[PDB]
Design a protein around this ligand. Structure first.
Ligand SMILES: O=C(O)[C@@](O)(COP(=O)(O)O)[C@H](O)[C@H](O)COP(=O)(O)O
Ligand SMILES: O=C(O)[C@@](O)(COP(=O)(O)O)[C@H](O)[C@H](O)COP(=O)(O)O
Ligand SMILES: [Mg+2]
Ligand SMILES: [Mg+2]
Lengths: 449, 102, 451, 99, 105, 105
């Protein structure tokens, strides 16, 4: 009663006359076919095996409306295949479902030897099924009462190995010296040398003490990342009982289903949510295979994180300046037009979702502050871990150096100075009044990446 | 008592303050002036000096209001604000005057 | 008061004199340094930045004992750096914590242009803080009353688009034709055209009807994968209320913390846990950068999935024979010696954790059955989705063809026949008593994938 | 035992059954045949006679299959179905033969 | 009524059965015989025909017991079991005899 | 206001203090100095007088810093700390200086 047998995927799943609907989810896939497999067939294989198809015709295809439901490759430019997915294919509010289709099996086919998801056009009708950040940039600045400059943070070091009590000594010195926030390392969860309950308690003593002493609101990104969702929610609950303004989650290692659970809990309990992108470079770094960070950044903004790391460009971890500028816009703006020169393949409307703070962290020190202010502007966190505790006089002095550097560069920008052309002179001028900053500049004056 | 943005720099001169007011205006933001005798972290709502200066066209206008606020409230901290109605958020806030007892 | 400033990572974190302890977690990383960065410095950067270190010396290093806590690269051989991580660094029972250290930041450093985690030795002292599978191969066979052959399953197709009622019709036809199980596609969760509660109800009616009609116990892997952990647990709950033997989770797309939540739920409720590895190839496809599936497979067995997909070797998705044999041993055996020819750089002791069923799925059909029985032996599921519903006479006939193929090959193996040399002949012999099998052999005889 | 649509009318003649099949085909729907010896309200999945007739062009082809199903299963209830793949739903179902 | 392993193949001849028993014995597993008139999915415990043949040394001994069981219980399904005490689990079970009515419905 | 270890003994002389510092150093632990005007049970973090003396080699060096701290902060309680980085914990802490008002209530 039907035509059984194997057909090329392109017969059903390649349609170069298809016009994408404003409700379709669009993917830009970088395809490296197995040699001898044409682009059109490789693209159709990806479109088929991420939507409705499989490797041979099935009688049950005729019990549904594949014309309505199938994904289809509708355009190919070079090695980039554009595939359109009907809105009805997706579970509302579920990044987990997006991934299970779009990146579920199609990266492992023999016919397609490498595959990278470069960008995705999330349609407004699908975006509205997501709640976005639980706080968002504007409300977070209101909660902190901080306006007009990048915010200062810093990872406590050594990454692991400090007792809970001594850990919060470092926090206290940093916050009292002028950092706005400090954070647990992504891999500091609850371990034999530092269990999370003790750390949460002592850190909040330190946060409260620094807030009272300086008069500025403080916070610490208490890492709730744990082996199970229930454990993360219990840690978040205790952070809330202690009056922490923040918790933190490693959203990729905990994973998107638990991340969604934490976002809901954070919103309902008045906590702001720092998101660490641990694991991202396992699959977003190489240009031939994986998922570009700008896609991860879109998904992050949808579930709802209040901040996510974006790289520094100039620090110890790899970053591309043009890509980073586009990602910053994707995280912060209401609407981002396509721009091939930043790898933004699609226009992205954000459907009124709240914006996310970019976070620049990793191997940075005072000499980087002119470049960082130039790249990110005010709505970012700059984190100095090593660049704080590695100060010759320790963490309080390091925090002061870093806070002064940011403020001096912001002041100079606002006065109309060229902070790139005059960056060194701006810092030297501020160091004339700030020995902490002079010592930091001397220590790290030869350290570049 | 630190006072958030620019608090870790030397206290600003009138000329330095005016440059920050010029930056607010250049960007099309709304300058404002607020003051309090309780500046600490519990206080989210300083007293407005008049309304935000929606109609201000020059930095000298704002600087005159700052001086007027200080003369009337010399015991208070006085801050300059800049508001962006398109983002619905404050975009710059810094203390321009600290009282003698600071 | 301390020596501030930047030092090479190798000064603290490269120690070729270090003797790994039986309690250390060991990693084998294939490293491609930035040109001009020595291997020793690149390996030391990975060790430092996945344990205790950062880019400059910090005063607070002197508040702890880096000799106790630092990871250290203790051997570099070719392009592989061996790195030892002290037991103390890890949170008991947390795969999430393992990932946050071992693969957290170290794949994105300027100094290390590509990095491939090939293998990890999980030490017994850490492994036994994990529970392993809630069921295990032997208990599962007892629950199903199925002994002495591979088990048959298959994904319902089209992946998406069937109503709940017609989805369950396909299930019914498959199960009553001789498949042991059927499953939801990994991307079938709850959608406008097929909402999960409707599917779960109708599918279990089909399962019960097929079991009563055939006399053989059946199951369907109901996919509980959802956008939040709470929603996944709600779906698991309903499957339990309907008396399903099984639930299914996409453990990597849902993620490990939600997976662990479902595994705890599965222990409290007695359902078996099918684990789909959707997204694994995003991480594991390329040989220069990423994480090899064998590592993910270890993590899977530690949390406690009862099955995981392992690849087919011969079907539509990539999978090399040697690596797949290594992965099957890692999933099933109590102790697995190293063999770098299979990518096993370390020996792995499982210290009594239960074995996981390998699941071979994707682009396979009747002609693959001799090779599949040769590769996996009895203790595997073979799934035919397209290979069942794409039969000329539909899903019941397709299921029968696949079931007969497996049974004929098993019978022949047990009689002493060489199922590789005689595999095609054994299928031809069986097809003389089974027209469904003949029709399947004829339809797909020219359909081959490279191996 | 009532059998849902048309069960409250007199048993359909072959001519009357054919007209319903013609209606299924005219609307572009897929005709099918199912049968069972347990037609009661517990039973959601009667036995398929072959697959749904995706390729059928004429009502006469369907009636020949009905007669063949009747001859193989004279102790069963036999129903004609019509399936609309655009709504993913059965759009007409009635019993054509009672044992 | 399908009866699990080999149920989808033609009913086994005695020579085919004996080869399966030889497979059990050659791998050091324990052959056994069980029977029932209620073979469906609710029945996990068929009736023992004697205990498992722990001391069986040849397939012939087992075939002689199968013959005795099917002569004593011609109305029953009769299965051969193959038990591995090392893993505590059955490693092969299959039906060797089905009653007359099975093939005449 | 009791101040934990040795608080129930007579206030320590400088020679008694130095012997305790010698005990810290001889066991390879890190001496430090901290001070506060709020010594009670809600205060876990007194103010550092410089960082812990990681590089101190003699008790005399530590006594010189104690003298400097008590001259700079005569209104504060001042404690000697003794930190063991091998266990990540303080192994001895005691007050070496109390302000005048302590002894006159
Ligand atoms: O573990 C680390 O290396 C850090 O704490 C930085 O420490 P330092 O401040 O001492 O360099 C951050 O987690 C990285 O910046 C994350 O990388 P990214 O921001 O690119 O996600
Ligand atoms: O979506 C699919 O393609 C499948 O349902 C197979 O369908 P077919 O049976 O019709 O091929 C399975 O999910 C893949 O086999 C998984 O790949 P793996 O097992 O390698 O993780
Ligand atoms: Mg970190
Ligand atoms: Mg699938």
């Amino acid at each position: 009663q039907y035509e059984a047998g194997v057909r090329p995927y392109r017969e059903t799943y390649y349609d170069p006359d298809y016009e994408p609907k404003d409700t379709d989810l669009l993917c830009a896939f970088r395809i490296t076919p197995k040699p001898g497999v044409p682009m059109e067939e490789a693209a159709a294989a990806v479109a088929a095996e991420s939507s409705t198809g499989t490797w041979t015709e099935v009688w049950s295809n005729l019990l549904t409306d594949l014309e309505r439901y199938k994904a289809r490759c509708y355009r190919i430019e070079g090695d980039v295949a554009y595939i359109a997915y009907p809105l009805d294919l997706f579970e509302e509010g579920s990044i987990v479902n997006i991934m299970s289709s779009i990146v579920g099996n199609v990266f492992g086919f023999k016919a397609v030897q490498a595959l990278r998801l470069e960008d995705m056009r999330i349609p407004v009708a699908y975006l509205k099924t997501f709640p976005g950040p639980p706080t968002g940039i504007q409300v977070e600045r209101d909660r902190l009462n901080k306006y007009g400059r990048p915010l200062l943070g810093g990872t406590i070091k050594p990454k692991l190995g400090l007792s809970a009590k001594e850990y919060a000594r470092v926090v206290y010195e940093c916050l009292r010296g002028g950092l706005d926030t400090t954070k647990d390392d992504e891999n500091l969860n609850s371990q034999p040398f530092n269990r999370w309950r003790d750390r949460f308690l002592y850190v909040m003593e330190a946060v409260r003490k620094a807030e009272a002493e300086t008069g500025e609101r403080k916070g610490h990104w208490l890492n709730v990342t744990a082996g199970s969702t229930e454990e993360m929610l219990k840690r978040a609950e205790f952070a809330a009982e202690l009056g922490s303004r923040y918790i933190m989650v490693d959203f990729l290692t905990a994973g998107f289903a638990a991340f969604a659970s934490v976002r809901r809990w954070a919103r309902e309990n008045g906590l702001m949510l720092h998101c660490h992108r641990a694991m991202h470079a396992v699959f977003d770094r190489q240009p031939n295979h994986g998922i570009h960070f700008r896609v991860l950044a879109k998904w992050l903004r949808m579930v709802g994180g209040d901040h996510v790391h974006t790289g520094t460009v100039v620090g110890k971890l790899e970053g591309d300046r043009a890509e980073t500028l586009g990602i910053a816009d994707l995280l912060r703006e209401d609407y981002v037009p396509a721009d091939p020169g930043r790898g933004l393949f699609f226009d992205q409307d954000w459907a009124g979702l709240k914006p996310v703070f970019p976070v620049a962290s990793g191997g940075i020190h005072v000499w980087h502050v002119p470049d960082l202010v130039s790249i990110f502007g005010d709505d970012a966190f700059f984190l100095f871990g090593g660049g704080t505790h590695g100060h010759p006089r320790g963490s309080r002095a390091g925090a002061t150096a870093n806070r002064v550097a940011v403020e001096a560069v912001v002041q100079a920008r606002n006065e109309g100075r060229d902070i790139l052309a005059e960056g060194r002179e701006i810092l030297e001028e501020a160091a004339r009044s700030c020995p902490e900053l002079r010592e930091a500049m001397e220590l790290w004056g030869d350290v570049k990446f | 008592m630190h006072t958030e943005t620019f608090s870790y720099l030397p206290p600003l001169t009138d000329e330095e303050i005016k440059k920050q007011v010029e930056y607010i205006l250049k960007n099309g933001w709304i300058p404002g002036i607020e003051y309090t005798d309780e500046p600490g972290p519990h206080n989210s709502y300083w007293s407005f000096w008049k309304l935000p200066f929606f109609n201000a066209e020059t930095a000298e206008e704002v600087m005159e209001e700052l001086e007027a606020c200080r003369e009337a409230n010399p015991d208070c901290y006085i801050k300059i604000t800049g508001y962006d109605n398109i983002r619905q958020g404050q975009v710059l806030s810094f203390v321009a005057y600290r009282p003698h007892h600071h």
